[PDB]
């Protein structure tokens, strides 16, 4: 087509979605991790994670307001990944990289799994 | 704004 | 902080939100324009428009599944703007610029209003 | 990935 494009549009949308998350506006699901609860928007989770995409396209699970993650999932790893979903920023540190990569593999967040593999390979 |  | 950032994350999120819109997945509102109906996600509309932000933060209107726009709003202008919200791409043409700018002023989409004003000024 |  002959469209024009606003370079900062996608980033401004994500920033606003994160402001809604901060203020708990229109959040429609609770993610339960080892008795730690995280409120979020189903559409943002689906847009970021192959696991959430599969969960919320399921005709029965699409209607659930609570999702319980596998007990092996670390709440801090999940929190770091949820923040990444809403900001594009990943707080990757020596002390959390193993939990973050394990959580990203479970959530099916391929780009995160890729940078974790590379950061681990550089330290060996 | 840009030409994509 | 010491975060790393994935450059394409915001764009990939918006692309996935638009794929959900295309497939009518988790859309939670109908926008009615001069008897033309558009299905969308409330959070994306709020993230893009000062008008939708104000509507869906209202304690009564936040729960509505149908929103009727002012009858002066042109359905094509709305359609072009809805596409822009979900893609960052604006189909601005000589034949639609007046309807698009009027719709963007009503929806409170300041960056769109800005490029319309500039494109109009260049033709005078 | 970049340093923001
Ligand atoms: O690594 C990843 C990130 C990711 C996101 C999603 N999401 C969607 N895919 C396609 N259409 C709509 C949506 Cl919402 C699916 C798989 C994966 N895998
Ligand atoms: O031009 C524009 C675009 C736009 C978007 C919004 N959205 C939000 N603002 C702040 N926190 C959350 C959200 Cl969702 C408000 C005003 C305007 N004005
Ligand atoms: Cl990812
Ligand atoms: Cl705008």
CB-CB neighbours of C34 under 10 Å: 14
Question: C35 — phi, psi (to 5°)?
Answer: 60, 35
The secondary structure of C57-70 as a DSSP string is TSTTGGG-SEEEPP
Q: Under 8 Å CB-to-CB from A71, ≥6 apart: which residues?
A: A34
Q: If residue C37 lies in a helix (H) or strand (E), which one and from where to where?
A: strand C36-40
Q: What is the resolution of this structure in A?
A: 1.8
Q: What is the CATH number of the domain that holds C84?
A: 3.30.710.10
Ligand 1 pocket, residue A42 CB under 6 Å: no
Contacts of D4 in chain C (CB under 8 A): 3-5
| Structure-solving method | X-ray
Q: What is the DSSP letter of C96?
A: T
Q: Which residues contact C98 (CB under 8 A, 6 or more apart)?
A: none
How far is residue A4's CA from residue A10's CA, in Å, rounded to a whole number? 14
CA distance A70 to A3: 45
Strand partners, A37: A32
Are A32 and A66 in contact by the 8 Å Cβ rule? The answer is yes
Q: How many CB atoms lie within 10 A of CB C39?
A: 12
Range of the domain at A27: 1-124
Q: Show the tokens assigned to A13.
A: 């949308």
- Going A91 to A96 to A101 to A103, the CA torsion angle's sign is negative
Q: Where are the alpha helices (DSSP H) in chain C?
A: 9-22, 42-48, 50-56, 75-87, 97-107, 110-123
List the structure tokens of A36: 């730690």
Most B CBs within 10 Å, among A1, A5, A12, to test the B interface? A5
For residues C37 and C31, the answer to whether their CB atoms sit within 8 Å is yes
Structure-token pair, residue C27: 């859309």
Residue of C nearest to D1 (CA): C6
Helix C110-123 with C97-107: angle, nearest 10 deg: 150
Cβ-based contacts of C3 with chain D (< 8 Å): 4
Domain count, chain C: 1
């Amino acid at each position: 087509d002959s469209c024009i494009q606003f370079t900062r549009h996608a980033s401004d949308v994500l920033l606003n979605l994160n402001r809604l998350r901060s203020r708990d506006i229109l959040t429609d699901v609770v993610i339960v991790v080892s008795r730690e609860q995280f409120r979020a928007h189903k559409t943002v989770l689906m847009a970021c994670s192959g696991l959430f995409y599969s969960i919320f396209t399921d005709q029965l699970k699409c209607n659930l307001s609570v999702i319980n993650l596998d007990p092996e999932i670390n709440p801090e790893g999940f929190c770091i990944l949820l923040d990444f979903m809403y900001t594009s920023r990943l707080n990757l540190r020596e002390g959390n990289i193993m939990a973050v990569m394990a959580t990203a593999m479970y959530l099916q967040m391929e780009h995160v799994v890729d940078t974790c593999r590379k950061f681990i390979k550089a330290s060996e | 704004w840009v030409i994509p």
